[PDB]
Amino acid sequence: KFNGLTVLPPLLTDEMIAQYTSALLAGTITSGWTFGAGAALQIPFAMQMAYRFNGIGVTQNVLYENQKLIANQFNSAIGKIQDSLSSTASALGKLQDVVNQNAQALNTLVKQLSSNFGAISSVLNDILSRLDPPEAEVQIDRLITGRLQSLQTYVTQQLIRAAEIRASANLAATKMSECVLGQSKRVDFCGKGYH
Amino acid sequence: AMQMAYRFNGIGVTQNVLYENQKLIANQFNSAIGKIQDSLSSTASALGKLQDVVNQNAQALNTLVKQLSSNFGAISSVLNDILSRLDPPEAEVQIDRLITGRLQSLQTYVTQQLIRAAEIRASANLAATKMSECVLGQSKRVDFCGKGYHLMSFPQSAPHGVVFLHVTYVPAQEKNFTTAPAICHDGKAHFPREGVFVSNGTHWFVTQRNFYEPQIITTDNTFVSGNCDVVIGIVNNTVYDPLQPELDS
Amino acid sequence: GVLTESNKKFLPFQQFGRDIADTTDAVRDPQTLEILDITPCSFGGVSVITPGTNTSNEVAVLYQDVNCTEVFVAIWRVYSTGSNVFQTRAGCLIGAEHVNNSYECDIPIGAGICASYQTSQSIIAYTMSLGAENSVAYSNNSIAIPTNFTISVTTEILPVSMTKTSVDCTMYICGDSTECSNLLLQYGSFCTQLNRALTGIAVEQDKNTQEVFAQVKQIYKTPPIKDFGGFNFSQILPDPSKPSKRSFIEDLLFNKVT
Amino acid sequence: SNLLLQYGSFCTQLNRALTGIAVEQDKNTQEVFAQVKQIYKTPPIKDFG
Ligand SMILES: *[C@@H]1O[C@H](CO)[C@@H](O[C@@H]2O[C@H](CO)[C@@H](O)[C@H](O)[C@H]2NC(C)=O)[C@H](O)[C@H]1NC(C)=O
Ligand SMILES: *[C@@H]1O[C@H](CO)[C@@H](O[C@@H]2O[C@H](CO)[C@@H](O)[C@H](O)[C@H]2NC(C)=O)[C@H](O)[C@H]1NC(C)=O
Ligand SMILES: *[C@@H]1O[C@H](CO)[C@@H](O[C@@H]2O[C@H](CO)[C@@H](O)[C@H](O)[C@H]2NC(C)=O)[C@H](O)[C@H]1NC(C)=O
Ligand SMILES: *[C@@H]1O[C@H](CO)[C@@H](O[C@@H]2O[C@H](CO)[C@@H](O)[C@H](O)[C@H]2NC(C)=O)[C@H](O)[C@H]1NC(C)=O
Ligand SMILES: *[C@@H]1O[C@H](CO)[C@@H](O)[C@H](O)[C@H]1NC(C)=O
Ligand SMILES: *[C@@H]1O[C@H](CO)[C@@H](O)[C@H](O)[C@H]1NC(C)=O
Ligand SMILES: *[C@@H]1O[C@H](CO)[C@@H](O)[C@H](O)[C@H]1NC(C)=O
Ligand SMILES: *[C@@H]1O[C@H](CO)[C@@H](O)[C@H](O)[C@H]1NC(C)=O
Ligand SMILES: *[C@@H]1O[C@H](CO)[C@@H](O)[C@H](O)[C@H]1NC(C)=O
Secondary structure, three states, rough: OOOOOOOOOOOOHHHHHHHHOOOOHHHHHHOOOHHOOOOOOOOHHHHHHHHHHOOOOOOOOHHHHHHHHHHHHHHHHHHHHHHHHHHOOOOHHOOOOOOOOHHHHHHHHHHHHHHHOOOOOHHHHHHHHHHHHHHHHHHHHHHHHHHHHHHHHHHHHHHHHHHHHHHHHHHHHHHHHHHHHHOOOOOOOOOOOOO | HHHHHHOOOOOOOOOOHHHHHHHHHHHHHHHHHHHHHHHHHHHHOHHHHHHHHHHHHHHHEEEEHHHHHOOOOOOOOHHHHHHHOOHHHHHHHHHHHHHHHHHHHHHHHHHHHHHHHHHHHHHHHHHHHHHHHOOOOOOOOOOOOOEEEEEEEEEEEOOOOOEEEEEEEEEEEEEEEEEOOOOOOOOOOHHHOEEEEEEOOOOOOEOOOOOOEOOEEEOOOEEHHHOOOOOOOOEEEEOOOOOHHHHHH | OOEEOOOOOOOOOOOOOOOOOOOOOOEEOOOOOOEEEEOOOOOEEEEEEEEOOOOOOOOOOEOOOEEEEEEOOOOOOOOOOOOOEEEEEOEEEEEEEEEOOOOOOOOEEEOOOOEEEEEEEEEEEEEEEOOOEEEOOOOOEEEEOOOOEEEEEEEEOOOOOOOOOOOOOHHOOOOOOOOHHHHOOOOOOOOHHHHHHHOOOOOHHHHHHHHHHOOOOOOOOOOOOOOOOOOOOOOOOOOOOOOOOOOOOHHHHHHHHO | HOOOOOOOOOOHHHHHHHHHHHHHHHHHHHHHHHHOOOOOOOOOOOOOO
């Protein structure tokens, strides 16, 4: 709010953002993928896995004959993610570059306000006092084009950058419709391997 | 009637559903068309997406046209009037102000058009993908052709745009049951070939996975692997053999 | 700005502080060694929350990013500075009332607040309800198979192309002026480049309507025997009443676009 | 303030461009997350096999 750089708040608060992610995660367990299409129908989770080995050319007898090894292998897999996220901070590379690129846009824009842009000064009040208003309009005209062109540059950079996010928001919406609400047969879509 | 039968066979539903209920589906589809008939005719808010293309394009031109009556730092906004009033040795300075003020108003409009035209190609390629998959075949991508299991779609034209008519399949009424993931008859698991094992309380049944149709468990219904201790959730049953009464007579 | 007392400690030769973005905030008083801060005065955007003018005639303003004490200053109407002012997380709301209920979203405001027009009747500002909750009876021995089905028809609408438009940079900048025509040319190749950029858009629009529609090799013919096993396809097929081959549902689609 | 206004509709156009982005950001977080009809409840019996 220092020089007109207002920031609007998001409509969806972060408390209830986790409410959706506690609902998509709570229908994947019990109902399976049925709640994506019609109405949620409860399935035992040992049988819900059995629907998913049956999509990679693997017969049903693999799971229930080895139900204890897979359960411990999955539980240990979560623990590996637990240590990998907690130890290093370089895993979140993609989300960090969004904020930093946006932060360099504002700091470039703010620091442009202390440039003369062809005039003799860079203060709106000082040029009016020192020079006569019959000829101060020529000097203050230099602090129009020098500042108007610095705004249209930032807006054009924002419109191009905002097209990247929609291209990544539509890709994330595709994954939440296929990789979560069902099983995908696209090779190397949901991680390297059979999904 | 057989082209419909080729499409129920892609959602895990056996062929016997269609021809045993050919009259209910025909009236349900015919009534479905009539619902689109009234919904399109009554309200005009359904065509939101195609309307915003024209209005955004028409707002660009009216902004561009109204920029022609601005001084842009000069003393006037008429090309003919500035030449008559002021001497051409110094009218070139004033008419220079009606160069940069009008050239920058054109490159702004062109840059806005190049960004906006990239949106349409991203939507034209998505429409070309749907016409290649959702019309010329059947799609198994979940929530691609409407919310639900997909059957087919039909294309319709529109002024600067296309309109689809998806036909999906949605289950209606569910029932509680009791299940067990395996069956033991002779000290051995009896994994079913296609379906799960259900029971209403007295007799166990095997049925398909999206529509209730139970059958008596036979040897053809299942394949056998392993003994009767590794699996968890095992429930005993008797699996009838069709050969022994057939070989009896 | 707004001067106030500060807890910051300067250095005994130091005059006035600054910030990260080179902005002045801390100014030492010249005579007294007390330390003063600078806070910019309150400002924000003014928004109007209204229902449909066909329905009602009552509005409620929303002063954004402001504490609810600095209102009634403004500088519209005088009456819009009272009547149970309700503080939100996104700004100061005047003309509405707080409700402890929860309803679906009608008008977005910010930070999970929705305004509507409910019954006698006034404008309320509740907190949105994220749909009706549900709970499934999960157990290790339970299964649910549906016993009856439905067939439905949704509608998906996409745009394919925009209107082709060419603008002559010679006529637009200097329209029939000998002095302006020569002075425009010495600027260089700005005019030539723009007419080549707008041609790339106009060529691309023809390519867009070619890929979506022209994917069939041969035009097929509708058979005259319409016995389709019970299905009625006459609403979507072409009707020979019109001179064109336009169908019935297409006819409504063209009239709804102005 | 008076000399800026005679330039025309540059100020009006930019404030209409930036609201197009701000509306679009809310639409992005709506499509990715809000795809579930009813909020479900985690069962208390956590015996997941
Ligand atoms: C579970 O379903 C089976 C299959 O229909 C039922 O068995 C038949 O139920 C009818 C109901 O009137 C009886 O007339 C038949 O005699 C039953 N068949 C046999 C071979 O006895 C069974 O009763 C159902 N059980 C429950 C608890 O609903
Ligand atoms: C399924 O049937 C087997 C075969 O009868 C049962 O195993 C018997 O269990 C009883 C006591 O539970 C023992 O006294 C017998 O010696 C067992 N016989 C064999 C061959 O193992 C088994 O208990 C049954 N399971 C269920 C759940 O009914
Ligand atoms: C499955 O649902 C359909 C409708 O969703 C049922 O069809 C209706 O049945 C009732 C009672 O028989 C009739 O009064 C209606 O006219 C039917 N509707 C239509 C559009 O024909 C159908 O009966 C249900 N299936 C079963 C086995 O009950
Ligand atoms: C397919 O649906 C259309 C639309 O209702 C039917 O056309 C109407 O049919 C009724 C009687 O069935 C007539 O009274 C109307 O005059 C028809 N409309 C028009 C514009 O002529 C059509 O008959 C249906 N197809 C079949 C084979 O019955
Ligand atoms: C029957 O199913 C409903 C939901 O479909 C569930 O709420 C109810 O608890 C079930 N009852 C039994 C006895 O399983
Ligand atoms: C199913 O869960 C109940 C809950 O206590 C438990 O008593 C029972 O042993 C379980 N059965 C199987 C086969 O896991
Ligand atoms: C306008 O209001 C009248 C009276 O309530 C109603 O009959 C009419 O349908 C409304 N028009 C629209 C477009 O909502
Ligand atoms: C608004 O101003 C009053 C008085 O200045 C103050 O007590 C109150 O805390 C302020 N509101 C907020 C949210 O800070
Ligand atoms: C609404 O909540 C407030 C604060 O908890 C309380 O004072 C008021 O009585 C409540 N009103 C109703 C109708 O529950």
